[PDB]
Amino acid sequence: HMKISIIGAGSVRFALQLVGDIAQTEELSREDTHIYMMDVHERRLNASYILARKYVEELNSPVKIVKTSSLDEAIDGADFIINTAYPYDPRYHDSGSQRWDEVTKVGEKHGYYRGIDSQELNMVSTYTYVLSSYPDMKLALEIAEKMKKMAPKAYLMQTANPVFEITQAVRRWTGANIVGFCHGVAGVYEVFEKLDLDPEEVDWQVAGVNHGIWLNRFRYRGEDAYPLLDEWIEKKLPEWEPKNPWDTQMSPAAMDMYKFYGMLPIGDTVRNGSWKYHYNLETKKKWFGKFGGIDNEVERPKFHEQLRRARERLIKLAEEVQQNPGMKLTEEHPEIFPKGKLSGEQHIPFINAIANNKRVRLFLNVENQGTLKDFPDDVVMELPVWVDCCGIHREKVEPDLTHRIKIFYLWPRILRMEWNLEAYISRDRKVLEEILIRDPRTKSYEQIVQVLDEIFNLPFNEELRRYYKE
Amino acid sequence: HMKISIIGAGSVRFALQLVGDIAQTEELSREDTHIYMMDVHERRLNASYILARKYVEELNSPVKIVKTSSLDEAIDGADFIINTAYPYDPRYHDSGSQRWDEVTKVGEKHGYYRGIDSQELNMVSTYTYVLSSYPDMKLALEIAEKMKKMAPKAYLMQTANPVFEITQAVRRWTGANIVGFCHGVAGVYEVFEKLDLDPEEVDWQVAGVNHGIWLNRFRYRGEDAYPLLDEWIEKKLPEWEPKNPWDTQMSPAAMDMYKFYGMLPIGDTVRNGSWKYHYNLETKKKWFGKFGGIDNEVERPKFHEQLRRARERLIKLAEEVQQNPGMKLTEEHPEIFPKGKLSGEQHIPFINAIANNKRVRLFLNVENQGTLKDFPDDVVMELPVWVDCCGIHREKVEPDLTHRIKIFYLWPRILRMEWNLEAYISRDRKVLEEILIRDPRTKSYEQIVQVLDEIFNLPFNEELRRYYKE
Ligand SMILES: [Co+2]
Ligand SMILES: [Co+2]
């Protein structure tokens, strides 16, 4: 049997994406493939399970789908464990995004625009939680330790955030076989589209850290293609407009970073700029166009409300499936239940590469081990790799990242990772304080104490408060 | 002949200290030792020369003292070149400290308390100048390149600030035989005095970067002595009072850093804390006692005025020597012209070790070359070394610096060095801007542009403005 366990399968849309991809991958769509859907939130989990089962029936896939509320049962003997859990306490919240929103509001109350978790080169919303990401870190480490005992040959595929911090901590502190996953590299394809380049004719590479990746190689017809970006900047950037709040790859911010660093930041890296692009909403609109991007006080709550409505509709759709077994999810909701189209995401290609030797190029968070020679061997980087049944094989990164990327961007972000890990493992509030002492928004030490006090005293943070109790 | 050249010998008191030490070192107080005193400021230089010559006469030393206004003449065939020059333009200023004071005032005008050169872990006054330290860097590099051609066997002994940045840049960019000098390590002896320990019974070591050194080993009677510091903190810190504005080694700030980092910061490292200790004068007085330390808007101008008065008195004393050849400088001014007492500083012990094999332990700024294994080989560190005629021999640093010192202190300060070097060599104002974009005192990008504009437009910064002209 091939056991693929989705931890946090109450994240309905992602669970359905994974199931859909497995059921449309020939080498994996087999009777001996068992997909375990695990979560502690029964209403969400039941909905995901109902829709997943009806979905594979319509795809005429023979995969087995099992629902469980037991973490141990999901881990036991698993071949791949996909951690997409974003924990939350249903006594207070209906989503992990809600606990992030509420602590962010407390930060803003104390003078930290977009919350204390928003930091230079670290603006992506919902990425860390009170700096050290205690609930998310704790759960990943618990999974890793169970997996070492109950599934020693499994891969832990970490998708819940912070991918950088969690993958680092699990690797360093447990030695468990964890790999971090993020689709941010997909930004390159919009660069190629806006420059009118056939992507198949582009020789390209990216590298960096999660949400901190750079287009280090960009070549076309045997020449550097960056002069083509220079021409686009001069002729077309003035007319650029975001299609939606997430659209930033060709934004003024991205091009300002390219001018300074010498390479274009890719994907969510564009969100992770210095404070120059993020002082306030008006500044974000200058640098990202009319929406101000997605990491602001208007668009981020709006988006989280869209998610809530979307998941409630999926839960209702599951009730409809139970009442009308004759309906076709693939006909009435093709966007959610596609047939004959893979998602394009990396998770199931990874599984098919490891398990069935379908070799593929992916961008994964793995230990550097000398790929970027100026950084420590054990620091987790987002790197171009080839994956097959013999494991993960790092590409040579050529051209090297620029001097400015290293000293002004990667090293500061790597140090922040180390600060955050130290804040977690030390259980020492003084480390959280020191992080905010390096925060440009801090005006006084008393401000730091008070904002942390109020965050810790939120009712849903009792375990966190006790964790850090001096 | 043994040629020791003091570049910036118009720094009268330091020049006299060097001369006094040479003339009281048996292996160096010889007819074949020639001390060249060089500077471009004739009134200062003439005074230093007059007093130096009268001084060695009273010490009955046979050393030869030569005065020159020619840099090439001073460098030509030198064995040791001591760069203590702090350049300034006499059309505007009477000291290098004055150009620093005036740019600092402009910074404060634009909302940067204690000037843009004051940064986290980098509060020491007059250490950098408009971040990249253009005039000071430029002069050191000019000396290094002349020395490679005209004195290929010489040591360049860098004492002018920034010692870290300049020593790094000269080593990396010219490969010249430069070594950086600073006496900050002397703070350890006040620790031993306040804990009632015979210094000769203490087994100790420090290491770090310039003004960023830590008491990594502190042992007494075969045990860790840090518990003795813990007892002093509990019983005696509440009654601690600074003797003068420079007195900070046992201050609340120093002990707060010890509590966080696990080792005591030594010397000027105590001045180089986070912004926690430096938001404003009242905060500095909380953490450093009644003066607020030396790096504030009251004590630093007061001290620079004391320096001006002191140097004017020395210039007048030189006129008095010329009029009254019969007076004894050693009798009427023993503090300035000591006899039978070495200064305790490292410069002349270094020379006697290299030249005459009088081996000695010193703390010098030299390339890491694996001494602190987590940092690059070529980064200049302030390290414990033994010096003899075979050169500089790094001690093993044991215990290693703590994890927190590395990730929260040394790496950020090293990155700042790299930022500053990049700002210099790139000639790119955008790098200076990026440095201020990482500055907690920055409220907006427009503020950065305006403060840099006004600094560049000061009349005495014309060469600097043209250097950075886009
Ligand atoms: Co991501
Ligand atoms: Co110094």
PDB file of C-alpha atoms in Angstrom, chain A residues 138-332:
ATOM      1  CA  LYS A 138       4.738  22.887  18.150  1.00  0.00           C
ATOM      2  CA  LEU A 139       2.453  20.822  15.898  1.00  0.00           C
ATOM      3  CA  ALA A 140       5.113  20.291  13.220  1.00  0.00           C
ATOM      4  CA  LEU A 141       7.614  19.103  15.828  1.00  0.00           C
ATOM      5  CA  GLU A 142       5.022  16.737  17.302  1.00  0.00           C
ATOM      6  CA  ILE A 143       4.342  15.292  13.844  1.00  0.00           C
ATOM      7  CA  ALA A 144       8.063  14.920  13.144  1.00  0.00           C
ATOM      8  CA  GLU A 145       8.703  13.040  16.386  1.00  0.00           C
ATOM      9  CA  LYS A 146       5.744  10.705  15.863  1.00  0.00           C
ATOM     10  CA  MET A 147       6.880  10.147  12.260  1.00  0.00           C
ATOM     11  CA  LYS A 148      10.393   9.187  13.343  1.00  0.00           C
ATOM     12  CA  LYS A 149       8.879   6.429  15.494  1.00  0.00           C
ATOM     13  CA  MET A 150       5.794   5.390  13.479  1.00  0.00           C
ATOM     14  CA  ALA A 151       6.818   6.163   9.854  1.00  0.00           C
ATOM     15  CA  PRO A 152      10.621   6.285   9.648  1.00  0.00           C
ATOM     16  CA  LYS A 153      10.719   6.130   5.824  1.00  0.00           C
ATOM     17  CA  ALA A 154       8.139   8.878   5.242  1.00  0.00           C
ATOM     18  CA  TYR A 155       8.663  12.360   3.906  1.00  0.00           C
ATOM     19  CA  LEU A 156       7.091  15.168   5.909  1.00  0.00           C
ATOM     20  CA  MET A 157       5.898  17.665   3.284  1.00  0.00           C
ATOM     21  CA  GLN A 158       5.502  20.936   5.161  1.00  0.00           C
ATOM     22  CA  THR A 159       3.119  23.452   3.602  1.00  0.00           C
ATOM     23  CA  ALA A 160       1.861  25.300   6.694  1.00  0.00           C
ATOM     24  CA  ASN A 161       3.638  28.528   7.495  1.00  0.00           C
ATOM     25  CA  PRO A 162       6.225  29.607   8.424  1.00  0.00           C
ATOM     26  CA  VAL A 163       7.696  27.134   5.908  1.00  0.00           C
ATOM     27  CA  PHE A 164      11.235  28.481   6.395  1.00  0.00           C
ATOM     28  CA  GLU A 165      11.259  28.543  10.205  1.00  0.00           C
ATOM     29  CA  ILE A 166       9.384  25.240  10.632  1.00  0.00           C
ATOM     30  CA  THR A 167      11.398  23.282   8.065  1.00  0.00           C
ATOM     31  CA  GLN A 168      14.601  24.616   9.654  1.00  0.00           C
ATOM     32  CA  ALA A 169      13.578  23.779  13.208  1.00  0.00           C
ATOM     33  CA  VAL A 170      12.317  20.278  12.388  1.00  0.00           C
ATOM     34  CA  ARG A 171      15.460  19.487  10.396  1.00  0.00           C
ATOM     35  CA  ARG A 172      17.866  20.906  12.967  1.00  0.00           C
ATOM     36  CA  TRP A 173      16.125  19.786  16.174  1.00  0.00           C
ATOM     37  CA  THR A 174      14.701  16.375  15.149  1.00  0.00           C
ATOM     38  CA  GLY A 175      16.559  15.277  12.018  1.00  0.00           C
ATOM     39  CA  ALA A 176      13.191  14.127  10.651  1.00  0.00           C
ATOM     40  CA  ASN A 177      12.864  13.830   6.860  1.00  0.00           C
ATOM     41  CA  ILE A 178      11.063  17.142   6.324  1.00  0.00           C
ATOM     42  CA  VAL A 179      10.878  19.118   3.058  1.00  0.00           C
ATOM     43  CA  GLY A 180       9.211  22.535   2.771  1.00  0.00           C
ATOM     44  CA  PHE A 181       6.866  23.374  -0.103  1.00  0.00           C
ATOM     45  CA  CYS A 182       5.822  26.692  -1.656  1.00  0.00           C
ATOM     46  CA  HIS A 183       4.616  27.628  -5.146  1.00  0.00           C
ATOM     47  CA  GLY A 184       6.044  31.178  -5.156  1.00  0.00           C
ATOM     48  CA  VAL A 185       8.427  30.324  -8.012  1.00  0.00           C
ATOM     49  CA  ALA A 186       5.402  30.343 -10.345  1.00  0.00           C
ATOM     50  CA  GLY A 187       5.828  34.131 -10.602  1.00  0.00           C
ATOM     51  CA  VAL A 188       8.454  33.617 -13.329  1.00  0.00           C
ATOM     52  CA  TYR A 189       5.758  32.655 -15.832  1.00  0.00           C
ATOM     53  CA  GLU A 190       4.101  36.062 -15.581  1.00  0.00           C
ATOM     54  CA  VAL A 191       7.482  37.695 -16.258  1.00  0.00           C
ATOM     55  CA  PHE A 192       7.746  35.620 -19.436  1.00  0.00           C
ATOM     56  CA  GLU A 193       4.151  36.434 -20.419  1.00  0.00           C
ATOM     57  CA  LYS A 194       4.614  40.197 -19.968  1.00  0.00           C
ATOM     58  CA  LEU A 195       7.870  40.122 -21.980  1.00  0.00           C
ATOM     59  CA  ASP A 196       6.215  38.032 -24.745  1.00  0.00           C
ATOM     60  CA  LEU A 197       8.588  35.082 -24.333  1.00  0.00           C
ATOM     61  CA  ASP A 198       7.726  31.450 -24.941  1.00  0.00           C
ATOM     62  CA  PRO A 199       8.511  29.970 -21.493  1.00  0.00           C
ATOM     63  CA  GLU A 200       9.878  26.840 -23.178  1.00  0.00           C
ATOM     64  CA  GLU A 201      12.535  29.001 -24.864  1.00  0.00           C
ATOM     65  CA  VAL A 202      13.691  30.612 -21.591  1.00  0.00           C
ATOM     66  CA  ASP A 203      16.699  29.238 -19.725  1.00  0.00           C
ATOM     67  CA  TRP A 204      15.969  30.280 -16.152  1.00  0.00           C
ATOM     68  CA  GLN A 205      16.717  29.553 -12.511  1.00  0.00           C
ATOM     69  CA  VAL A 206      15.696  30.976  -9.135  1.00  0.00           C
ATOM     70  CA  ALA A 207      17.135  30.542  -5.662  1.00  0.00           C
ATOM     71  CA  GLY A 208      17.003  32.007  -2.171  1.00  0.00           C
ATOM     72  CA  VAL A 209      14.895  31.306   0.907  1.00  0.00           C
ATOM     73  CA  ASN A 210      11.158  30.760   1.103  1.00  0.00           C
ATOM     74  CA  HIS A 211       9.434  33.956  -0.047  1.00  0.00           C
ATOM     75  CA  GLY A 212      12.953  35.233  -0.643  1.00  0.00           C
ATOM     76  CA  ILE A 213      13.838  33.872  -4.074  1.00  0.00           C
ATOM     77  CA  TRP A 214      15.550  35.653  -6.959  1.00  0.00           C
ATOM     78  CA  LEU A 215      15.653  35.138 -10.732  1.00  0.00           C
ATOM     79  CA  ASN A 216      19.388  34.521 -10.755  1.00  0.00           C
ATOM     80  CA  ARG A 217      19.441  33.233 -14.338  1.00  0.00           C
ATOM     81  CA  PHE A 218      17.249  34.652 -17.098  1.00  0.00           C
ATOM     82  CA  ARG A 219      18.407  33.808 -20.624  1.00  0.00           C
ATOM     83  CA  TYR A 220      16.757  33.811 -24.035  1.00  0.00           C
ATOM     84  CA  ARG A 221      18.105  32.844 -27.463  1.00  0.00           C
ATOM     85  CA  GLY A 222      21.594  32.430 -26.046  1.00  0.00           C
ATOM     86  CA  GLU A 223      21.786  35.856 -24.384  1.00  0.00           C
ATOM     87  CA  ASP A 224      21.021  37.448 -21.050  1.00  0.00           C
ATOM     88  CA  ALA A 225      17.336  38.332 -21.168  1.00  0.00           C
ATOM     89  CA  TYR A 226      17.472  40.970 -18.434  1.00  0.00           C
ATOM     90  CA  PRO A 227      17.956  43.745 -21.047  1.00  0.00           C
ATOM     91  CA  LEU A 228      14.458  42.773 -22.174  1.00  0.00           C
ATOM     92  CA  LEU A 229      13.209  43.498 -18.654  1.00  0.00           C
ATOM     93  CA  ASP A 230      15.063  46.826 -18.754  1.00  0.00           C
ATOM     94  CA  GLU A 231      13.152  47.730 -21.931  1.00  0.00           C
ATOM     95  CA  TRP A 232       9.842  46.662 -20.390  1.00  0.00           C
ATOM     96  CA  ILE A 233      10.570  48.857 -17.365  1.00  0.00           C
ATOM     97  CA  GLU A 234      11.259  51.862 -19.563  1.00  0.00           C
ATOM     98  CA  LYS A 235       8.369  51.393 -22.011  1.00  0.00           C
ATOM     99  CA  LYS A 236       5.593  49.509 -20.181  1.00  0.00           C
ATOM    100  CA  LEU A 237       5.930  49.812 -16.391  1.00  0.00           C
ATOM    101  CA  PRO A 238       4.263  53.277 -16.446  1.00  0.00           C
ATOM    102  CA  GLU A 239       1.056  51.650 -17.729  1.00  0.00           C
ATOM    103  CA  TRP A 240       1.221  48.596 -15.458  1.00  0.00           C
ATOM    104  CA  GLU A 241      -1.899  47.936 -13.391  1.00  0.00           C
ATOM    105  CA  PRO A 242      -2.582  45.053 -10.983  1.00  0.00           C
ATOM    106  CA  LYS A 243      -5.344  42.710 -12.128  1.00  0.00           C
ATOM    107  CA  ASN A 244      -6.224  41.948  -8.485  1.00  0.00           C
ATOM    108  CA  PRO A 245      -4.727  42.485  -4.998  1.00  0.00           C
ATOM    109  CA  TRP A 246      -2.309  39.547  -5.422  1.00  0.00           C
ATOM    110  CA  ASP A 247      -0.852  40.876  -8.700  1.00  0.00           C
ATOM    111  CA  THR A 248       2.605  42.275  -7.864  1.00  0.00           C
ATOM    112  CA  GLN A 249       5.236  40.435  -9.925  1.00  0.00           C
ATOM    113  CA  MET A 250       5.710  43.304 -12.414  1.00  0.00           C
ATOM    114  CA  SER A 251       4.916  46.066  -9.899  1.00  0.00           C
ATOM    115  CA  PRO A 252       6.974  49.209  -9.267  1.00  0.00           C
ATOM    116  CA  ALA A 253       8.131  47.593  -6.006  1.00  0.00           C
ATOM    117  CA  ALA A 254       9.445  44.523  -7.823  1.00  0.00           C
ATOM    118  CA  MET A 255      11.287  46.689 -10.343  1.00  0.00           C
ATOM    119  CA  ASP A 256      12.748  48.944  -7.633  1.00  0.00           C
ATOM    120  CA  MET A 257      14.161  45.842  -5.929  1.00  0.00           C
ATOM    121  CA  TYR A 258      15.526  44.585  -9.256  1.00  0.00           C
ATOM    122  CA  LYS A 259      17.310  47.911  -9.792  1.00  0.00           C
ATOM    123  CA  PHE A 260      18.959  47.712  -6.364  1.00  0.00           C
ATOM    124  CA  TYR A 261      19.743  43.988  -6.153  1.00  0.00           C
ATOM    125  CA  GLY A 262      20.521  43.263  -9.823  1.00  0.00           C
ATOM    126  CA  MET A 263      18.071  40.336 -10.023  1.00  0.00           C
ATOM    127  CA  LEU A 264      14.276  40.280 -10.017  1.00  0.00           C
ATOM    128  CA  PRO A 265      12.551  39.054  -6.827  1.00  0.00           C
ATOM    129  CA  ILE A 266      10.084  36.303  -7.689  1.00  0.00           C
ATOM    130  CA  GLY A 267       6.600  35.623  -6.368  1.00  0.00           C
ATOM    131  CA  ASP A 268       5.942  36.419  -2.736  1.00  0.00           C
ATOM    132  CA  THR A 269       9.469  37.841  -2.465  1.00  0.00           C
ATOM    133  CA  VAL A 270       7.965  41.005  -3.997  1.00  0.00           C
ATOM    134  CA  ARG A 271       5.674  41.260  -0.974  1.00  0.00           C
ATOM    135  CA  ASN A 272       8.737  40.805   1.265  1.00  0.00           C
ATOM    136  CA  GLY A 273      10.494  44.110   0.683  1.00  0.00           C
ATOM    137  CA  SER A 274      11.981  46.636   3.055  1.00  0.00           C
ATOM    138  CA  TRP A 275       9.732  49.116   4.880  1.00  0.00           C
ATOM    139  CA  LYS A 276      10.263  51.515   1.948  1.00  0.00           C
ATOM    140  CA  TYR A 277       7.240  49.946   0.211  1.00  0.00           C
ATOM    141  CA  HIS A 278       5.077  49.405   3.311  1.00  0.00           C
ATOM    142  CA  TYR A 279       5.033  52.416   5.705  1.00  0.00           C
ATOM    143  CA  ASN A 280       1.284  52.823   5.212  1.00  0.00           C
ATOM    144  CA  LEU A 281      -1.524  52.060   2.785  1.00  0.00           C
ATOM    145  CA  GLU A 282      -0.844  55.116   0.603  1.00  0.00           C
ATOM    146  CA  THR A 283       2.786  53.998   0.253  1.00  0.00           C
ATOM    147  CA  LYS A 284       1.704  50.450  -0.640  1.00  0.00           C
ATOM    148  CA  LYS A 285      -0.583  51.872  -3.322  1.00  0.00           C
ATOM    149  CA  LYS A 286       2.306  53.888  -4.761  1.00  0.00           C
ATOM    150  CA  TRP A 287       4.468  50.787  -5.057  1.00  0.00           C
ATOM    151  CA  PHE A 288       1.916  48.032  -5.767  1.00  0.00           C
ATOM    152  CA  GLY A 289      -0.865  49.835  -7.619  1.00  0.00           C
ATOM    153  CA  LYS A 290      -4.428  50.551  -6.711  1.00  0.00           C
ATOM    154  CA  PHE A 291      -5.071  47.753  -4.202  1.00  0.00           C
ATOM    155  CA  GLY A 292      -1.972  48.323  -2.105  1.00  0.00           C
ATOM    156  CA  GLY A 293      -1.226  44.649  -2.545  1.00  0.00           C
ATOM    157  CA  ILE A 294      -2.737  41.949  -0.359  1.00  0.00           C
ATOM    158  CA  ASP A 295      -0.918  42.655   2.940  1.00  0.00           C
ATOM    159  CA  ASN A 296      -2.866  45.683   4.158  1.00  0.00           C
ATOM    160  CA  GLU A 297      -5.742  46.595   6.447  1.00  0.00           C
ATOM    161  CA  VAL A 298      -8.338  46.625   3.645  1.00  0.00           C
ATOM    162  CA  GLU A 299      -7.486  43.750   1.303  1.00  0.00           C
ATOM    163  CA  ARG A 300      -6.308  41.169   3.830  1.00  0.00           C
ATOM    164  CA  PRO A 301      -9.515  41.206   5.938  1.00  0.00           C
ATOM    165  CA  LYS A 302     -11.496  41.261   2.692  1.00  0.00           C
ATOM    166  CA  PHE A 303      -9.631  38.181   1.456  1.00  0.00           C
ATOM    167  CA  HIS A 304     -10.044  36.294   4.735  1.00  0.00           C
ATOM    168  CA  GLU A 305     -13.775  36.995   4.568  1.00  0.00           C
ATOM    169  CA  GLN A 306     -13.807  35.581   1.018  1.00  0.00           C
ATOM    170  CA  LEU A 307     -12.132  32.424   2.364  1.00  0.00           C
ATOM    171  CA  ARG A 308     -14.739  32.053   5.120  1.00  0.00           C
ATOM    172  CA  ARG A 309     -17.621  32.372   2.658  1.00  0.00           C
ATOM    173  CA  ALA A 310     -15.931  29.955   0.246  1.00  0.00           C
ATOM    174  CA  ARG A 311     -15.385  27.248   2.866  1.00  0.00           C
ATOM    175  CA  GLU A 312     -18.950  27.591   4.150  1.00  0.00           C
ATOM    176  CA  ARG A 313     -20.224  27.055   0.606  1.00  0.00           C
ATOM    177  CA  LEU A 314     -18.086  23.909   0.300  1.00  0.00           C
ATOM    178  CA  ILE A 315     -19.466  22.598   3.596  1.00  0.00           C
ATOM    179  CA  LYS A 316     -22.955  23.250   2.235  1.00  0.00           C
ATOM    180  CA  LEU A 317     -22.039  21.550  -1.050  1.00  0.00           C
ATOM    181  CA  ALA A 318     -21.141  18.426   0.928  1.00  0.00           C
ATOM    182  CA  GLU A 319     -24.629  18.419   2.446  1.00  0.00           C
ATOM    183  CA  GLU A 320     -26.029  18.719  -1.076  1.00  0.00           C
ATOM    184  CA  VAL A 321     -23.954  15.752  -2.276  1.00  0.00           C
ATOM    185  CA  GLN A 322     -25.408  13.629   0.505  1.00  0.00           C
ATOM    186  CA  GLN A 323     -28.950  14.630  -0.477  1.00  0.00           C
ATOM    187  CA  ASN A 324     -28.475  14.314  -4.260  1.00  0.00           C
ATOM    188  CA  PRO A 325     -26.055  11.464  -5.024  1.00  0.00           C
ATOM    189  CA  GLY A 326     -26.921  11.921  -8.709  1.00  0.00           C
ATOM    190  CA  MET A 327     -25.335  15.353  -9.126  1.00  0.00           C
ATOM    191  CA  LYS A 328     -21.996  15.721 -10.923  1.00  0.00           C
ATOM    192  CA  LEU A 329     -19.526  17.924  -9.041  1.00  0.00           C
ATOM    193  CA  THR A 330     -17.333  18.033 -12.153  1.00  0.00           C
ATOM    194  CA  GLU A 331     -20.218  19.480 -14.209  1.00  0.00           C
ATOM    195  CA  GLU A 332     -21.725  21.967 -11.744  1.00  0.00           C
TER     196      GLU A 332
END
